Ligand binder design. Sequence first.
Ligand SMILES: NC(=O)c1ccc[n+]([C@@H]2O[C@H](COP(=O)([O-])OP(=O)(O)OC[C@H]3O[C@@H](n4cnc5c(N)ncnc54)[C@H](O)[C@@H]3O)[C@@H](O)[C@H]2O)c1
Ligand SMILES: NC(=O)c1ccc[n+]([C@@H]2O[C@H](COP(=O)([O-])OP(=O)(O)OC[C@H]3O[C@@H](n4cnc5c(N)ncnc54)[C@H](O)[C@@H]3O)[C@@H](O)[C@H]2O)c1
Ligand SMILES: [Mg+2]
Ligand SMILES: [Mg+2]
Ligand SMILES: [Zn+2]
Ligand SMILES: [Zn+2]
Ligand SMILES: [Zn+2]
Ligand SMILES: [Zn+2]
Lengths: 408, 414
Amino acid sequence: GVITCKAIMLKEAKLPGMSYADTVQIIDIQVDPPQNVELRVKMLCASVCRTDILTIEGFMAPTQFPKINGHEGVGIIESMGPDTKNFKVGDVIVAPTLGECQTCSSCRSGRTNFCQNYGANESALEPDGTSRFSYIDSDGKKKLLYYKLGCSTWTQYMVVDSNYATKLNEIAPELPPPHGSILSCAFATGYGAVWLDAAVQEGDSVAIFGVGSVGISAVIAAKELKAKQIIVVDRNEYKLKMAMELGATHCINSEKLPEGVTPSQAVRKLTPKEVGVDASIESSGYDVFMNEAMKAAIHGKAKTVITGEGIYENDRIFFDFKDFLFGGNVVGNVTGRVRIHSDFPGLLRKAQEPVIRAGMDKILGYDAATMKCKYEVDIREGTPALLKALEEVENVDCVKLVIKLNDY
Amino acid sequence: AKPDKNGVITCKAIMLKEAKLPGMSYADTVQIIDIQVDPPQNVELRVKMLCASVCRTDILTIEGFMAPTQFPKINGHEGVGIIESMGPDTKNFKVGDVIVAPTLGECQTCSSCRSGRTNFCQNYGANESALEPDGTSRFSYIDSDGKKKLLYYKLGCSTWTQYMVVDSNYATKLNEIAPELPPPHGSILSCAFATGYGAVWLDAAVQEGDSVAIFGVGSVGISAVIAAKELKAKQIIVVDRNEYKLKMAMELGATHCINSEKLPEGVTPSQAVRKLTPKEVGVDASIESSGYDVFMNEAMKAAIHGKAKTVITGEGIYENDRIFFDFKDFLFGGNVVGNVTGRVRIHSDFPGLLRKAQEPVIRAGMDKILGYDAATMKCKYEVDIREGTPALLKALEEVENVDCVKLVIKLNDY
Ligand SMILES: NC(=O)c1ccc[n+]([C@@H]2O[C@H](COP(=O)([O-])OP(=O)(O)OC[C@H]3O[C@@H](n4cnc5c(N)ncnc54)[C@H](O)[C@@H]3O)[C@@H](O)[C@H]2O)c1
Ligand SMILES: NC(=O)c1ccc[n+]([C@@H]2O[C@H](COP(=O)([O-])OP(=O)(O)OC[C@H]3O[C@@H](n4cnc5c(N)ncnc54)[C@H](O)[C@@H]3O)[C@@H](O)[C@H]2O)c1
Ligand SMILES: [Mg+2]
Ligand SMILES: [Mg+2]
Ligand SMILES: [Zn+2]
Ligand SMILES: [Zn+2]
Ligand SMILES: [Zn+2]
Ligand SMILES: [Zn+2]
């Protein structure tokens, strides 16, 4: 059967000068039943990744409008296509951008999550060029809606290929929805960038450039892995203070440095003999911080892990060439290199330990008694409340906005 | 080649007066002169140079690369020679040892050395000052006013001179492992050959059955081909615009060649490389050895997402001293490292490279790079520092000859 539900439609890219009102609306959509190995999923909540706002601005979607937004969220399996294996109706799942076939040479390497068989669905469509999402326009015509990539989370019901899904309910039966939501992107990204990609060991020094939800997740990982030194860099004093409270040892307000002192110079001055850090994480989306993160790393030895995204002129980023040749080591990172079968189960177990749960609670501003987050909007309460919430994503103390989609 | 009563040697060296900026000539800045080489101090080696050989970075140095204030200088970082004398604190070297001394030493005690996975030593890093730590230089000359003037190094030393002084922490010896290795082979082991060979062997960690792409088959890239063939790569794809050097790469084990200037409309070099791989997945290892900023991005893009490493060896004078990467490709599995001297650590890795260099197939490859004639000990492109500046200027222009892979500068009798 076809489900009618609420979803957040993006009519067109919000280009500079345009408002959220110009492009973002809560509408009724039609969600087709799942086919093949798909899950149709009753969404509990989505949470707002900075990449969700980039999507609203047209990021990676030159033609793929109108769409339903969102890649960060959690929900419950309502129904499955006839070929689906290893899932049941009622399982709680997240479905990030990359699957894990376990047989391709990338999977078999043991050192990456960039699966050759279950890669990013850049088409924002089913492989036959159709979509499980449609709506009736004010002209009465049935119109296609694009996904974000393989799915959209800013909807009461989504459909996703089960080769991208991983279940929460067996390991973490009591995990609240907003915590499941941040495990699907922001928290897996920051935690994994430190744990898996930079491979932080006890006694290592770490620099994190940008302490939004991703960078704070990285601080939580660095503290858990017993980093000797955790340096955070941002312009936002509220989030720097939150980073310090959750384990960071030194903070730098990049907008308060002297004009002649770069962020990388300030970071290196905190390290013995100005040698730099064992691990350098960028989690800002500021193209300048991608270059500064590369420079703050110990030449050759240290890895710089780039998680940041933004809308860059010619879709290009830059590095200072001499500092790059003489020991730069830079990797692109998607979802913290957290492989959905090999790594995610272990991350889920770790997320339930009390200090890690306390860190996720602080990111979210979660109240256990009411199951409310500090910044939360409900899709059932109208487009104006949503437009205000999306503006308030820029509020100094908004770390993670949660979009409630159904009763918990 | 004999010191005066104060231990000072007078010899020939190639002086760079100032940066050769765009539109300037070799004649504007390059001159063979008589210099005074002071005796070695502390742990220094004073080295009778046999030959230097011309790395593209030597030409970038003529053009002002990494030397905003460090003129006049003696050029050169690629060469080999014999210890003539040592500072009083020197350990583990003897007068008569044959040495090379690249940009990075190996202290074996810093956290970078102890990692086992890099040559960027914290204690013996690149000497960017082009001077002694006290602001002096072992090199001077008497100018036309009769005044004694300082000459900068390249970095920790200069090779375009009959006599060089270098901190012994940067040196590694050839004569115990490879007593019969000829000078020009020793010279390319000091930079070009270590860089291309080590980029493949150590940094990209190429395995039997791996696919490899090499962007730029000058001496460094052809050294990478030799390593990739030795390591039994399944596929070795070379990219360049120089037909002569692409053909040489094919003769030394490349499987596929791509002329970047002859690509069909709307096919990038990364797309051309990917089209030669199963399901257009790209290569297990991507080596950039061109100095072309475009190829640094194309190399990144040709790599299998996440799994493969892109090793950047290239150097150049870039707008705003920066290079660029396509962000979407970079985020979704880009993996790029800067490489100096092939990550070949002078104590831990250089000895095995040197043993490898004496194996018949590897020696044949070095001979082809050099166009070496064992009968005459002459290379195809060779100029002698004792034969005057005009011959040197002609040789520098001829670096651009399509069949010049490695110009050698003879410095002394062998
Ligand atoms: N690679 C992935 O899988 C992945 C996953 C999550 C998010 N992202 C990207 O990673 C980044 C972090 O995600 P997020 O949701 O935490 O983002 P966010 O926007 O909530 O947080 C970014 C932080 O960086 C700081 N920052 C940004 N520009 C700055 C500047 N000019 N000077 C100083 N500080 C600056 C901000 O003040 C903020 O605290 C974003 O670019 C996002 O698009 C990617
Ligand atoms: N990282 C290190 O330790 C190290 C050591 C050696 C040299 N280098 C640098 O590595 C690079 C290779 O050194 P080399 O001595 O072999 O240089 P080279 O100039 O002899 O060879 C470079 C090759 O790349 C090709 N190339 C350059 N620009 C091109 C373009 N626009 N289109 C197509 N092909 C192009 C050339 O045709 C040539 O065959 C140079 O940039 C050099 O400065 C660095
Ligand atoms: Mg499908
Ligand atoms: Mg000295
Ligand atoms: Zn995200
Ligand atoms: Zn796979
Ligand atoms: Zn060189
Ligand atoms: Zn060291």
